[PDB]
Structures are given as C-alpha cells and as structure tokens.
Amino acid sequence: MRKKFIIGGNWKMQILNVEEAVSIATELATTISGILTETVDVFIAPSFNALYSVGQAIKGTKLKLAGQNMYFRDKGAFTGEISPDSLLDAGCEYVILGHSERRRIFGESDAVINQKVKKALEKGLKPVLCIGETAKEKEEGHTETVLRTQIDESMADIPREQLNLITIAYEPVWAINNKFLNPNSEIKTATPEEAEKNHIFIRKLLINKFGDEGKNILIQYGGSMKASNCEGLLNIGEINGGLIGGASLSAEKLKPIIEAAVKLG
Amino acid sequence: RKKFIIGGNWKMQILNVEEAVSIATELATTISGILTETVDVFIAPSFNALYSVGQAIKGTKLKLAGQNMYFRDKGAFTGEISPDSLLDAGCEYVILGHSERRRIFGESDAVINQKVKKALEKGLKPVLCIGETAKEKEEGHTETVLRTQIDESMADIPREQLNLITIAYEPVWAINNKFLNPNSEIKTATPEEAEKNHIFIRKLLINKFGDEGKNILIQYGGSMKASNCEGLLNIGEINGGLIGGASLSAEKLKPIIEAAVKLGK
Numbered sequence A: 001m002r003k004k005f006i007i008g009g010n011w012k013m014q015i016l017n018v019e020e021a022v023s024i025a026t027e028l029a030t031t032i033s034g035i036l037t038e039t040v041d042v043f044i045a046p047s048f049n050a051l052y053s054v055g056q057a058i059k060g061t062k063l064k065l066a067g068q069n070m071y072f073r074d075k076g077a078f079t080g081e082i083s084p085d086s087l088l089d090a091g092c093e094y095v096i097l098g099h100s101e102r103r104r105i106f107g108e109s110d111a112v113i114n115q116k117v118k119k120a121l122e123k124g125l126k127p128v129l130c131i132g133e134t135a136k137e138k139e140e141g142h143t144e145t146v147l148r149t150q151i152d153e154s155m156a157d158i159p160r161e162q163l164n165l166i167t168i169a170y171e172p173v174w175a176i177n178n179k180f181l182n183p184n185s186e187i188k189t190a191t192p193e194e195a196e197k198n199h200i201f202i203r204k205l206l207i208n209k210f211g212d213e214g215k216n217i218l219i220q221y222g223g224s225m226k227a228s229n230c231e232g233l234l235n236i237g238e239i240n241g242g243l244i245g246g247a248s249l250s251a252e253k254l255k256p257i258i259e260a261a262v263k264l265g
Numbered sequence B: 001r002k003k004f005i006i007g008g009n010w011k012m013q014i015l016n017v018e019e020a021v022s023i024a025t026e027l028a029t030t031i032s033g034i035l036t037e038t039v040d041v042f043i044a045p046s047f048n049a050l051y052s053v054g055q056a057i058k059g060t061k062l063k064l065a066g067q068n069m070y071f072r073d074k075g076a077f078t079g080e081i082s083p084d085s086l087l088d089a090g091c092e093y094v095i096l097g098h099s100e101r102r103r104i105f106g107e108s109d110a111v112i113n114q115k116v117k118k119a120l121e122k123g124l125k126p127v128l129c130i131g132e133t134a135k136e137k138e139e140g141h142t143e144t145v146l147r148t149q150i151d152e153s154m155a156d157i158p159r160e161q162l163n164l165i166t167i168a169y170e171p172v173w174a175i176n177n178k179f180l181n182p183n184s185e186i187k188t189a190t191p192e193e194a195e196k197n198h199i200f201i202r203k204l205l206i207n208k209f210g211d212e213g214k215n216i217l218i219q220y221g222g223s224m225k226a227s228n229c230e231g232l233l234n235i236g237e238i239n240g241g242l243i244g245g246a247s248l249s250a251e252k253l254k255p256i257i258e259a260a261v262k263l264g265k
Helices: A018-033 A048-057 A084-090 A100-105 A110-122 A135-139 A143-154 A160-165 A192-210 A230-234 A251-263 B017-032 B047-056 B083-089 B099-104 B109-121 B134-138 B142-153 B159-164 B191-209 B226-233 B250-263
Strands: A005-010 A040-045 A063-067 A094-097 A126-131 A167-170 A219-221 A241-244 B004-009 B039-044 B062-066 B093-096 B125-130 B166-169 B218-220 B240-243
Touching (some): A005 A094, A005 A167, A005 A251, A018 A063, A018 A251, A018 B083, A040 A094, A040 A251, A048 A084, A048 B083, A084 B017, A084 B047, A110 A160, A126 A143, A135 A143, A167 A192, A230 A251, B004 B093, B004 B166, B017 B047, B017 B062, B047 B062, B109 B125, B109 B142, B142 B191, B191 B218, B191 B226
Parallel strands (some): A063 A094, A094 A126, A126 A167, A219 A241, B004 B240, B093 B125, B166 B218
C-alpha cells in the first residue's frame, strides 16, 4: 500500500571520462546502500562509453544501470548506433527513450521511438519513455493533443503483458530556458501545480488506453528536480519518481531526492 | 612510396565487449608482423566497446576510431558522445558524416562541419565521409552534391589543421537499400566510377586548399574486399579504404592490408 518511486539519473553528456563515471557511480552505490529503499528503485544512465565499466563497478549493488538511448534493431549497418544487446551486455536494466533532446534536437519521431520501445520490451529492458510539449505547442493550445499523440504513437502496438515494464517521464519542455528548443515563446516557470495537472492528464490517458494495466505505469516528473523542491513534487499523487538531470551528477546532490522518495514510501 | 589508411567501420555489427576485444586483439597481432610503414590501420568499434578495445590494443600498431561524436565537449545532450570520451578511450580517428548518419539519421552539413572542426581542435583525425545517392546521381547531381558536402562540411577549417583530415567517398547510389535509394535503379559500383569520383574530389580539394589539398588522402568507401581491393587500391587517387564487412575479422581484413602494403613499397 506504500507509494513506489523510480529515481532515474540522466547523466546526458556531462561526464566524459570512464574513470570519473565509475568513481561517481561507485560513490552513489555506496551512499544509497544504507538508505531503506524497499519501495524506491534508483538508476543512473551514463554515456555509452562508460556503461560497461560502470556496470562492472556497481554489479551486485542496489544501483541500477540505464542506457540514454539505443537503436531499434539488434545489429546491422547503423554507424554510430548502439544495440539493445550492447546495453544488456553492459548490465543495463533500463533504457531512456524519446528524451526531449532526442526528439527535438536530433529529430527522433514517434514511429522511430515506438520501434525502440517495442524492442526494449522484447529484450527485457525497462523503457523510460519520455514525452512532453514545447513552449509554442503549449501556448498555442496543443498540450493535450501533443501528449496524446506521443502516447498513442510511441506506445502503438505494445503487448499488454509487457506494459508493466514501462515508465513514463513527463518533460515540461516548455519550461526549458533554451531558445533552440523554444525559439519564439515566453519561457514560463514550471510550477508544481502545472506538474500535477500534466501528470493527472497522463494518468487518465493511460487508463483510457490500457485500463487496469494503465493505472500501474509509474509517471516520473522530468522537469527540474533538486533537493530544494523534490519533496513537494514527489508528494503529488500522480508523480511516482523523477528523471533527474544536474542533481544526479553526484551522490551529494541526488541523496536528498532519494531520501524524500523513501520518506514518502 | 604510396601511403594508405585502411579503416574498419564495425558499424552496429559487433554487440558484446568481449567479442570486440577478441577481434581487435587478433587484428593487432595479425598486423604486428606485417611491414606497415606506409599503411595506417584503424578500427571503429561501437561506443560501448571503445574503452576496453583501447586498453587491449594499447601500444600496438592498430589505431582506434570512434564512429561518431557530438560537436560540443559537454552538456545536456542525451544519447551523444563527447570528443573527450573518444580521447579517453584512446581514439586517434573519428568517422564523421558517414552516409548512415547523413541519410538515415539526418545529420546536416552544418552539424557535420562543427564536428569536423571540433575533432581537429581536439587533435582527433577526422574521417569525413561524403557521397551521393542513386536519385542524386541519376539526376546528374553527383558533382553538386559532393561539392556541397565538401564546401559546407569543411567550412572554416584552419589551413594548418588540414593535414589531419581524411576524406572517404561513399557510392551510396550503389547500396542495395530501398530506404537509401527508393525510386532509382541500383547499379553495382565499378572501379572506373570510383576513379572518376576520386579524381573529381582531388580537383576540388586542390581548388580550395592548394598544396594542402593535394595531401588529403581519399579513402574509397564503397564495398572493398579481398577479391577487389587490389584493383581499387591501385587507382591513383584512392589512398585507402573505409571498410565494412571485411573489417569484422582479421582473416577478412588482412589481404586488404597486405594489398595496401604491396602497393606502398
């Protein structure tokens, strides 16, 4: 009956050397060992170059490993792409898919992301499927249309018996202070009130499409989450974790977030 | 003595780190006994294996390459790999603008241009790939496509960094793939076509860069295997090969390396 949380750390392209990634990952695994995390899963997503060495270093700990992306085929002539099998080889248990940077900077479509989600489930990877609308989309009244389109098309044709492996992360891309992502629009403050609104909307969509299996899909908040605001956000009913950016780059920054999730479970 | 660079692009064909290390170790041993004074050999494993392969082949004659990278050192780029991560793994080369990146994953010349300049700033040797599709070739746009790729991918490169660049010409038009070449007859590539394109590329490089442009080696990036490598390497303006399937084993790659050595005496 206790609230479950997944705290995911997306290291993006911030940790460059394998030695540093392993050092941070080991320090985080050491820190969370003592925290009573029966109701809270914690993963980090290092860059591809460090996955294998990090997985070696944190094997047997409570810290889980994720890829930041993957291709939707197992092997072939895809220069620069990473196979789901390579994630598994490194010990990954999760994979982030459809992150707003993949969608909006690198042009990954819902159809491409849908293929990757289905592949991850086939491979036994737990996909963290990210969705979210830009400032122009929100200001022009398309928040609901965009999020529905992304759910419908990124999760097209998923076997219902595989749905329990899926986590959704909502990204309020409209709130990112980046004129590339949000060229011609005001950049508004991501409030907890907005976050609750969006998470309730996503829950209703998941219920409508999938019924009971849909109630069970955890929705991480993917806006900015740090020590100073994590308790307010994680206490919102339909927020069941966080996909964390800068605050996941050290155990010192991430520990208060994990502590808040544990307190609330 | 004619110089050659023989580059193995493993694409997404080798999934596990252990297999990547075993093949790389076998290849480093294979070439240790071959007199390769005028022939540089590199392999480009996938990102997950770079660090381990770099460890296994440190101090051998086998050089290491990345298949791609981003054009910033660090930042919020989920799924991207920094040039610093390539350097951390021991990479000396990086493949940039490979046809799969351009044509499947939509990398523009402006993006590839930033990657090339970044690679040079970092001291990496870029292998800049160019090439036209079957539609472009059939419409008579081969020269316009290659010139556009050369002008825009190489824009603003400092003349004194230019000796680090290798060009690889890809006859994408010959690739038996309807996604790349949807509405055109797919023709098999010939050495005579290869020579024509390589000579044209040489002319453009001398027109742009004078004597520095004569020195830029041009790899052939079409299908090169034991059975046809000697004929191709034998062509004046072909100074190596960017090798796909035949670089996945020492047995398949050694006769290409041996042909280049024979032609480099």
